[PDB]
Amino acid sequence: MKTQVAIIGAGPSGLLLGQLLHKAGIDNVILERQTPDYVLGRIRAGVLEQGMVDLLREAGVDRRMARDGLVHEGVEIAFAGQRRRIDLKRLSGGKTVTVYGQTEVTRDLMEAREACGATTVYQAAEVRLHDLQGERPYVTFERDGERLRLDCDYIAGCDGFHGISRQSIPAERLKVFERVYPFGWLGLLADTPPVSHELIYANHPRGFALCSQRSATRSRYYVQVPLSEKVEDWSDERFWTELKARLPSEVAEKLVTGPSLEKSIAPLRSFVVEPMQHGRLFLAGDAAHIVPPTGAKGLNLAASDVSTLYRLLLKAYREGRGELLERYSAICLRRIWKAERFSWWMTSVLHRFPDTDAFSQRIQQTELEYYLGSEAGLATIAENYVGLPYEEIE
Amino acid sequence: MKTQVAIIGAGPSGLLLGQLLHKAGIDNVILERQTPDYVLGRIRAGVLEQGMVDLLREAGVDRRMARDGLVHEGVEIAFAGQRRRIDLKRLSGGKTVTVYGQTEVTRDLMEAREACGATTVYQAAEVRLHDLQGERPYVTFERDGERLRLDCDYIAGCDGFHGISRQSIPAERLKVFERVYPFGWLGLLADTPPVSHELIYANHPRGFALCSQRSATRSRYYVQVPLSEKVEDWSDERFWTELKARLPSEVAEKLVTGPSLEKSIAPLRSFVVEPMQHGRLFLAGDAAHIVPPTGAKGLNLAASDVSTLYRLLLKAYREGRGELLERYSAICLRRIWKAERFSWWMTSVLHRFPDTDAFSQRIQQTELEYYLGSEAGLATIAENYVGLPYEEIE
Ligand SMILES: Cc1cc2nc3c(=O)[nH]c(=O)nc-3n(C[C@H](O)[C@H](O)[C@H](O)COP(=O)(O)OP(=O)(O)OC[C@H]3O[C@@H](n4cnc5c(N)ncnc54)[C@H](O)[C@@H]3O)c2cc1C
Ligand SMILES: Cc1cc2nc3c(=O)[nH]c(=O)nc-3n(C[C@H](O)[C@H](O)[C@H](O)COP(=O)(O)OP(=O)(O)OC[C@H]3O[C@@H](n4cnc5c(N)ncnc54)[C@H](O)[C@@H]3O)c2cc1C
Ligand SMILES: O=C(O)c1ccc(O)cc1O
Ligand SMILES: O=C(O)c1ccc(O)cc1O
Ligand SMILES: [Br-]
Ligand SMILES: [Br-]
Ligand SMILES: [Br-]
Ligand SMILES: [Br-]
């Protein structure tokens, strides 16, 4: 079996990369460990940057998004009883973000991939990578018991945090950066109208709360929760009572509650590996880095890694410029570290930490008061929130 | 013995407050524990904000400053081999800072006080405060052995961190915020031309370094040093070799070194007390709060507390508005917390901390790269550096 670019993983990264490549005439095969239905059952991200919205259009997979996605021009931050709005559009020079669920994007791409007929192998068991430093690397996997080999020129590891690709690079070639936060997010998806037309991030003494949305009739809420909590310990009712307890009263009063469609706990983490490649293997998305969701950068960073890898593969195949591929990590890492810093900052100012002394609490409050009341402070939040510019290469 | 306003301490705060009050017709007596020469021997701050420069003019003590002070329009920050300049003037909307030593300001005020004939009692031993909540508080002290009593309407505690005034307020009425940093600054004053026309803050792997000045022929340099260091362990030569080791080579090459006129180690600290008053006692300057010197806010905060207290005392004496004095702490604390936050931020990004993991180091570097390369980031540094606006009261 043979292809040009082998792609491990069919989440947003793998599908987006694959779609881009296919439209340009570069053969690519995707290997996914799960079934399509399993991948489609993941409720995750909901905020997309301008850059990602353009990459979807470029991949020709934007019809449904242009119809159903909500364009937001601001986000609110509530702390100490007051609600402060950040005008993203005015402060960033006219950029906005688009709210459209990750499940939707994945569904749009999977459909687009099916229609064009490109190769996708689900239930690809025991994927293994070989000859990463040769001229002809290959992948082996098991489809219903028999071991099959797939030959390619390059391998794109788009298998997420627990994927096999990052684990395939000799640990001594890698430099790992990581911070684990002492809390997670308990998220809840409901078929009720969102409480606000825009998102509300909330710093409350009991912990962080976030009011988000998926459509005009579907909502998503999160509340900061310690690592000891179990999802079965949180009935729908306990969640609504806690959410209400963390929001300003004029917001809590108009909250339409309802039974959960999905409920889960996601732990917060920061993680970066350098470099992001090894021989003919290139990492993209969660396979290479993790950000706490506070800044909504995860899926967005995945898009920029992919945007970069794709353009570098094009130069390589169409222009015979195979040497530019060495620049992948340098290019990606610049944007990644700034997104990691924004995510970390957002996380530290909106969440309540366990053993904080009096001084740190006052500083946290003052960070908010300064950044939310200063035109220059608001602009730092805004330009980072909408998304810093993609570097163009060459 | 009787006066209207008793002032404890003859450093910048006490003298400035006293001078302002005197010019407006409000009698005031200053009690200082040391001799004039001792106070004059302290080498400390060198950077003055616009607001402080105007308060000096208002006190009519600005002739020498207008002549010898250096107006700076920018400051440089060096990290990872590169030097980045922050244009304060362009970024803050035209404000600048003025470099004029603290010793000079103190000398100008002491001279001004002498000429106008206001009462200053040096070597005022064992100062004690009494009847703080009555209508007539008083101060007792010892001048060459005999105990004298001074009656007044109000007491301004301008006695610094180790003064008696903060210690005179019942500890249960006070709320203390404090952070101690695991390092200090080893400063050196030399009679050599400064290495740059503007200040250079430096983040280097060996620790922080700062190149400052006092005049066109006098310089002041600092290098971050751990708490274990003793000044007698640092010969002039050891200092120059370390300073040079922490600066970019094109800067180190042109450094004119020389024997020290003064050399000392100042530990870094953050400290705030709330409220800043008790009955007829009002705290000002270091008596109420400490900031690490990284943002040059100490003497500047002292000026704003004093500017506020003075205007409130004027309303009280001239207008019979004695009730406005209750607003002192609320007014002062707003500016103080923002200055404390700026100082903390500057400190955390320019200094090397002892037990930092890989992630934090990368974030520290990225903080600098973001704030120094973003127009909005640069503006946050600039408006804070020149000094946020003084609140006007009423
Ligand atoms: C559980 C979780 C919750 C999250 N929640 C949020 C959230 O609420 N908000 C938010 O803003 N962001 C959230 N994120 C982050 C955001 O969803 C991601 O950054 C985004 O999904 C990254 O896409 P990806 O393609 O890189 O990774 P993924 O979506 O993880 O896709 C990787 C894919 O590769 C497959 N794969 C794994 N191992 C192998 C293998 N050995 N062989 C073959 N295929 C393999 C997996 O089955 C998976 O389909 C979350 C991430 C996770 C892991
Ligand atoms: C040792 C030290 C080093 C510093 N170094 C720097 C530096 O390098 N850079 C910088 O930016 N800032 C520095 N600062 C901070 C800056 O100098 C101050 O914020 C500024 O001096 C505050 O002025 P003040 O009048 O409030 O206090 P001070 O200048 O401390 O004056 C308070 C005065 O009150 C007197 N006093 C004390 N106790 C009594 C008493 N019991 N009775 C009567 N009088 C009393 C003292 O003798 C003193 O004269 C430093 C502060 C200190 C303490
Ligand atoms: O799921 C969301 O809608 C969502 C929105 C904002 C954010 O920062 C993180 C999130 O997961
Ligand atoms: O003494 C200085 O000149 C000086 C300058 C800048 C600064 O932040 C701190 C300082 O003590
Ligand atoms: Br979703
Ligand atoms: Br995220
Ligand atoms: Br000085
Ligand atoms: Br200071």
Give the full edge-to-edge strand order of the sheet including B260-274.
B82-87, B74-79, B200-203, B209-213, B219-225, B175-190, B260-274, B289-290
Tokens representing B336 are: 């103080």
Nearest CA to CA, how far is A384 from chain B (Å)?
10
Tokens representing B93 are: 């909307």
Which helix or strand (DSSP H or E) is residue B353 part of? Answer: none
Parallel/antiparallel/unpaired status of strands B47-48 and B97-99: antiparallel
Residue from A168, A142, A127, A124 nearest A281 by CA:
A168
Q: Residue A186: exposed, middle, or buried by beta-carbon count in 10 A (0-12, 13-18, 19+)? A: buried
Q: Does residue B201 carry a catalytic annotation?
A: yes
Breaks (C-N over 2.5 A) in chain A follow: none
Can you say how many angstroms the Cα of residue B158 is from the centroid of all Cα atoms in its chain?
Answer: 12
Any atom of ligand 2 within 6 Å of the Cβ of B184: no
Which residues in chain A are contacts of B179 at CB distance < 8 A?
357, 359-360
Q: CA distances (Å), B311 to each of A125, A141, B3, B55, B288, in order?
A: 77, 79, 18, 12, 19
Q: Residue B392: exposed, middle, or buried by beta-carbon count in 10 A (0-12, 13-18, 19+)? A: exposed
Q: Best mutation site among A91, A177, A343, A361 for testing chain B: the one with the most B CBs within 10 Å?
A: A177
Residue B306, annotated as binding a ligand: no
| Nearest-Cα residue of chain A relative to residue B179 | A359
How many whole angstroms separate alpha carbon B68 and alpha carbon B76? 22
Q: Does residue A315 carry a catalytic annotation?
A: no
Give resolution in angstroms: 2.3
With an 8 Å Cβ cutoff, is B355 touching chain A?
A: no
The one-letter amino acid code at A81 reads: G
Q: Which are the contacts of A182, defined by CB distance < 8 A and separation ≥ 6?
A: A226, A227, A353, A354
Q: Residue B319: exposed, middle, or buried by beta-carbon count in 10 A (0-12, 13-18, 19+)? A: exposed
- Geometric angle at alpha carbon A176, from A55 and B365, rounded to 5°: 80
Instruction: Answer whether the bond into residue A275 is a cis peptide, omega within 30°.
Output: yes
Half-sphere exposure (Cβ direction) of A242: Cα atoms closer than 13 Å: 21
- Geometric angle at alpha carbon A204, from A200 and A207, rounded to 5°: 100
How many whole angstroms separate alpha carbon A6 and alpha carbon A29? 5
Tokens representing A98 are: 């688009």
Q: Which are the contacts of B208, defined by CB distance < 8 A and separation ≥ 6?
A: B185, B201, B202, B222, B223, B224, B246, B350, B351, B352
Read off φ and ψ for residue A175, nearest 5 degrees. -120, 110
With an 8 Å Cβ cutoff, is B348 touching chain A?
A: no
How many whole angstroms separate alpha carbon A204 and alpha carbon A352? 8
Nearest CA to CA, how far is B364 from chain A (Å)?
9
Tokens representing B170 are: 């019942």
Q: Phi-psi category of A9—alpha, beta or left, where left has phi over 0 and alpha has psi -120 to 50?
A: left
Q: What is the 3-class SS of B295-319, one letter each residue?
A: HCCHHHHHHHHHHHHHHHHHHHHHH
- CB-CB under 8 Å, B337 with A369: yes
How many whole angstroms separate alpha carbon A165 and alpha carbon A149? 16
Q: List B271's β-bridge partners, or say none.
A: B178, B290
Q: Which are the contacts of B354, defined by CB distance < 8 A and separation ≥ 6?
A: B182, B226
Catalytic one of B137, B194, B275, B293 = B293
A340, A363, A380: residue with CB nearest B374:
A380
With an 8 Å Cβ cutoff, is B356 touching chain A?
A: no
Tokens representing A306 are: 């992919």
Tokens representing A235 are: 């009935």
Q: List B28's β-bridge partners, or say none.
A: B5
- Geometric angle at alpha carbon A387, from A382 and A389, rounded to 5°: 120
Residue B42, annotated as binding a ligand: yes
Q: What is the DSSP letter of B325?
A: G
Q: Does residue A197 carry a catalytic annotation?
A: no
Q: Which are the contacts of B192, defined by CB distance < 8 A and separation ≥ 6?
A: B217, B218, B219, B256, B257, B258
Q: What is the DSSP letter of B69?
A: P
With an 8 Å Cβ cutoff, is A369 touching chain B?
A: yes
Any atom of ligand 4 within 6 Å of the Cβ of B72: no
Q: Does residue A293 carry a catalytic annotation?
A: yes
Q: CA distances (Å), B309 to each of A148, B337, B354, B391, in order?
A: 82, 17, 40, 12
Half-sphere exposure (Cβ direction) of A333: Cα atoms closer than 13 Å: 18
- The three-class DSSP label of residue B56 is helix
Residue B150 and residue B57 in contact, taking contact as beta carbons nearer than 8 Å: no
Residue B315 and residue B324 in contact, taking contact as beta carbons nearer than 8 Å: yes
Per DSSP (E only), the strands in chain B are 5-8, 28-32, 47-48, 70-72, 74-79, 82-87, 97-99, 120-122, 125-130, 138-143, 146-151, 154-157, 175-190, 200-203, 209-213, 219-225, 260-274, 277-278, 281-283, 289-290
Tokens representing B198 are: 């503007």
Solved with: X-ray
A270, A380, A382: residue with CB nearest B359:
A270
Q: List A222's β-bridge partners, or say none.
A: A187, A210
How many whole angstroms separate alpha carbon B2 and alpha carbon B144? 19
What's the alpha-carbon Rg for chain A, to the nearest Å?
21
Residue from A345, A356, A373, A87 nearest A207 by CA:
A356
Q: Which are the contacts of B135, defined by CB distance < 8 A and separation ≥ 6?
A: none
- Token look-up 């794109």 returns A156
How many whole angstroms separate alpha carbon B309 and alpha carbon B7? 12
Q: Which are the contacts of B5, defined by CB distance < 8 A and separation ≥ 6?
A: B21, B26, B27, B28, B29, B152, B153, B154, B155, B156, B313
Can you say how many angstroms the Cα of residue A111 is from the centroid of all Cα atoms in its chain?
Answer: 20
Nearest CA to CA, how far is B336 from chain A (Å)?
10
Q: Residue B310: exposed, middle, or buried by beta-carbon count in 10 A (0-12, 13-18, 19+)? A: buried
Nearest CA to CA, how far is A363 from chain B (Å)?
6
**Residue A394 CB coordination number (10 Å):** 8
Residue from A331, A325, A268, A345 nearest A301 by CA:
A331
**Residue A111 CB coordination number (10 Å):** 12
How many whole angstroms separate alpha carbon B371 and alpha carbon B77? 11
Q: Which are the contacts of B290, defined by CB distance < 8 A and separation ≥ 6?
A: B161, B269, B270, B271, B298
Residues in chain B: 394
Q: Phi-psi category of B43—alpha, beta or left, where left has phi over 0 and alpha has psi -120 to 50?
A: beta
Parallel/antiparallel/unpaired status of strands A175-190 and A219-225: antiparallel
Parallel/antiparallel/unpaired status of strands A5-8 and A200-203: unpaired
* End-to-end C-alpha distance for chain B, whole angstroms: 34
How many whole angstroms separate alpha carbon A70 and alpha carbon A52? 14
Q: Which are the contacts of B187, defined by CB distance < 8 A and separation ≥ 6?
A: B43, B220, B221, B222, B262, B263, B264, B265, B266
Among protein residues, the one with the nearest Cα to ligand 2's atom 10 is B45
Residue from A165, A166, A135 nearest A152 by CA:
A135
A175, A272, A359: residue with CB nearest B178:
A359
- CB-CB under 8 Å, A344 with B363: yes
Residue from B89, B86, B84, B59 nearest B71 by CA:
B89
Any atom of ligand 4 within 6 Å of the Cβ of B50: no
Any atom of ligand 4 within 6 Å of the Cβ of B103: no
- A119-147 core/surface letters (b: 16 or more CB in 10 A; e: else): bbbbebeebebeebeeeebbbebeeeeee
Any atom of ligand 2 within 6 Å of the Cβ of B209: no
With an 8 Å Cβ cutoff, is A377 touching chain B?
A: yes
- CB-CB under 8 Å, A366 with B341: yes
Nearest CA to CA, how far is B202 from chain A (Å)?
21
Q: What is the 3-class SS of chain A, one letter each residue?
A: CECCEEEECCCHHHHHHHHHHHHHCCCEEEEECCCHHHHHCCCCCCEECHHHHHHHHHCCCCHHHHHHCEEECEEEEEECCEEEEEEHHHHHCCCCEEECCHHHHHHHHHHHHHHHCCCEEECCEEEEEECCCCCCCEEEEEECCEEEEEECCEEEECCCCCCCCHHHCCCCCCEEEEEEEEEEEEEEEECCCCCCCCCEEEECCCCCEEEEECCCCCEEEEEEECCCCCHHHCCHHHHHHHHHHHCCHHHHCCCCCCCEEEEEEEEEEEEEEECCEECCEEECHHHCEECCHHHCCHHHHHHHHHHHHHHHHHHHHHHCCHHHHHHHHHHHHHHHHHHHHHHHHHHHHHCCCCCCCHHHHHHHHHHHHHHHHCHHHHHHHHHHHHCCCCCCCC
**Residue B361 CB coordination number (10 Å):** 14
Tokens representing B325 are: 């004095």
Q: Does residue A182 carry a catalytic annotation?
A: no
**Residue B144 CB coordination number (10 Å):** 6
A262 C-alpha to ligand 6 centroid (Å): 18
Residue A298 and residue A156 in contact, taking contact as beta carbons nearer than 8 Å: no
Any atom of ligand 3 within 6 Å of the Cβ of A347: no
With an 8 Å Cβ cutoff, is B374 touching chain A?
A: yes
Q: Which are the contacts of A200, defined by CB distance < 8 A and separation ≥ 6?
A: A75, A76, A77, A78, A83, A210, A211, A247, A251
Tokens representing A271 are: 């993680």
Domains delineated in chain A: 1-72+96-180+269-351 (3.50.50.60), 73-95+181-268+352-388 (3.30.9.10)
- B178-193 core/surface letters (b: 16 or more CB in 10 A; e: else): ebebebbbbbbbbebb
How many whole angstroms separate alpha carbon A192 and alpha carbon B226? 57
- Token look-up 């469609």 returns A261
- CB-CB under 8 Å, A359 with B177: yes
Which atom of ligand 1 is found nearest the CA of A47?
11
Catalytic one of B154, B328, B385, B390 = B385
Q: CA distances (Å), A288 to each of A152, A284, A291, B295, in order?
A: 21, 6, 11, 37
Q: Which ligand is nearest to the CA of A292?
A: 6
Which atom of ligand 3 is found nearest the CA of A296?
8
Tokens representing B37 are: 């020469």
With an 8 Å Cβ cutoff, is B340 touching chain A?
A: yes
Measured N-to-C along each axis, helices A50-58 and A12-24 cross at an angle, to the nearest 10 degrees, of 40
Which atom of ligand 3 is found nearest the CA of A102?
1
Tokens representing B49 are: 């904000």
B44 C-alpha to ligand 4 centroid (Å): 8
How many whole angstroms separate alpha carbon A8 and alpha carbon A30? 6
With an 8 Å Cβ cutoff, is B376 touching chain A?
A: yes
